[PDB]
Amino acid sequence: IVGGESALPGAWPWQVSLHVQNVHVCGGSIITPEWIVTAAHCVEKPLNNPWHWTAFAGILRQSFMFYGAGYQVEKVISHPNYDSKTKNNDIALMKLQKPLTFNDLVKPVCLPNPGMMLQPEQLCWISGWGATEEKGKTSEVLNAAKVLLIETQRCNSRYVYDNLITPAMICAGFLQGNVDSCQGDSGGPLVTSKNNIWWLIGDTSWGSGCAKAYRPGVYGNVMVFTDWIYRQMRAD
């Protein structure tokens, strides 16, 4: 996250950091104590294995992160309609062995019900352990910032993205730049405030550059995939 302020403890109690090879790689979102939502392209082969994945929850800083964290990750479920060359249906589900005990600073996000009347230019927040420079090095604490939602037809113009936005994706950020996501922010939760309730509407999938004009961030639309999440939850 470029141009963002540090988040105080107990602000976004849903940032789940996935640790592979004893180091954090991608983030995630917790909706139920038995499932975590993140991107599917990072869980691709050969990383598509139930083991070799450690989930750390409630860690407000990378200093406290060490040996000893949440239970082992169960079998990871990805969207079968996903592709590699063409970005589409980038959603993955990871289950935990032990249930996620709701601590003081722990609260799952609410899934958006079909039908919400989203404002074309609505305020939303992005949070994750990213960078603030040329591909950066790493992040030691939480970093969050607010962004706006970009309309689909305007984002799909010939000067932004020439027919590269599927109906299952949304654009967020500022067209002027200086505020956007960067590398390493895979699975960054995109939350919005509606009727004093926070909802998850986006999932960081891909982009171009970091905090540069004419290149906004691309987020996966969870509204279309809400049916697949419920189907997987009912099957499991």
Next chain:
Amino acid sequence: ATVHRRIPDLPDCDIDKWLNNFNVPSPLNWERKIFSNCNFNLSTLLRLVHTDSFSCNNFDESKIYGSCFKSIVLDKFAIPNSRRSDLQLGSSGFLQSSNYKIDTTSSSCQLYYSLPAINVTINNYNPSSWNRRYGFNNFNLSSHSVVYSRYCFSVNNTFCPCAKPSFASSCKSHKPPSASCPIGTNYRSCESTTVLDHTDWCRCSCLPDPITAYDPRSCSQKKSLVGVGEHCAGFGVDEEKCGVLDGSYNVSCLCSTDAFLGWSYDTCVSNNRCNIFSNFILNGINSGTTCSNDLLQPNTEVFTVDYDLYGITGQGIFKEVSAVYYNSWQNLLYDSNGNIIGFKDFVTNKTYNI
């Protein structure tokens, strides 16, 4: 009854001749002329030039009758029929923001007048150095039509609406036009980016246009407002329509006529007449040589007493006779011993005896 004749020392201003000129400039080409060291009659000027309204800012119209000024500055231009309300004292209109702003910090008078449109021709011209440099020409729209600017943009002496042919050649997607730029400038900022699959995505600046640009901080030409006494810096230029594709550095960078944006035109014909605006700038009150003669006694007819003839005062009678001894420089006839006996009127060429 009284007769007062005097030879003027300063010529007439002839303001009506310049105001009634048949070459009416557009608001984009507002002309300025400085009148100084001359005499004028204000009411005669307002009568000869058909005036619709006359008001003064920070100054009283009654005080103009009989005052002297150092110099008077006049600015005139035609009024479009659609934007006549933008000439109000203080307004965020296109006229006062792009063509000519009225100064509200000094004593100025505004005049609205008309002229028969059977003889009126509008002279449209672009007072932009950088726009004329890259291939601008005459408007060629219609007669009795005036052009007013809507957005004003300014650049430095480094702008060139052209991309580098070397950088534009290595672009397999969204190739911008490129051509040869004159000696000493800065080429258009274009950089190649990499996307998910395409590794030849070339992006440039000032997109899509400077009027509706997404990021003004990344475009060279910046929007500016006209000051007090300055013209429009120039119209907007669409960089996507300038130059040609794949030029081997052997072609100039001339934009098409459709590449210039930010200007509109409208007619000025109303009741077989054209409407013209004029602004008077007064410099120096109660001091100067540009005075008004509306408080002086007019040169009335000579009733053939109480006369003031070329600096000589007295009382007597007059009788119209013929006289051939008067030369070009002679006006008064004196007797053998210092007494005036005859004179000549320099407005009717009639000789009288006293």
Next chain:
Amino acid sequence: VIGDFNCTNFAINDLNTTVPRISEYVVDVSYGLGTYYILDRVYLNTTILFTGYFPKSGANFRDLSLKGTTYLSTLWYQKPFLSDFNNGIFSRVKNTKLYVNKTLYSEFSTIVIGSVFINNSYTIVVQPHNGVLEITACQYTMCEYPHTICKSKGSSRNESWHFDKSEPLCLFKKNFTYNVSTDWLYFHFYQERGTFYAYYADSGMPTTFLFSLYLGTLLSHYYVLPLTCNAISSNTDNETLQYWVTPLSKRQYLLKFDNRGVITNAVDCSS
């Protein structure tokens, strides 16, 4: 140095090669030469005793004509070329004629009259333009080294005697015309009680009134601007510039008028 504005520095040398010559012509007021008509007055067949500013009978003239080619000397802008305007001067001017493709052109030297020649005072300038005569008497920012150029067969320098972007505050302005085929021209200039008077004539006749101007300040210095040309030299045309000046004083004259107002004879009364 006459002015104070550094308006041009092209070629300013320092050489002493000019001295005013004393003319062999003697003032003779018997037939009218040296006398002027009153400002606006007509007299028919009378004899008048008039006390005014007239030149003295039996006086010599001094030439103040300066001609150069792309060079200006500093000594030209000092004494005795910058004379004192005590009461007035009577000047006889020679009309120099030039032919360009058998077309006659007339030009002679211009004279400037002032006190300090700065833009806080009024300075009187008389300059001819091929048949028309212009008088300014304005507040001009005079160059420190002024000069005049010839329009026909132009010189190397440019006409630069004042630097004013806009027209300054002037008290008088008018144009007069003269005969182009004449060979001698006469002038009268003098001041009395803060008023300035000017006279001129095309032929060997009494001069004609020009104008009157009330200033209130005493004019003390007059100067003749040098003329730069490439044809008036003694190498191609064998022509010369001549501008003689004699001092004026308050004397008494006896004027004779005919039945039509023409001056016939004049007596100096002190010769």
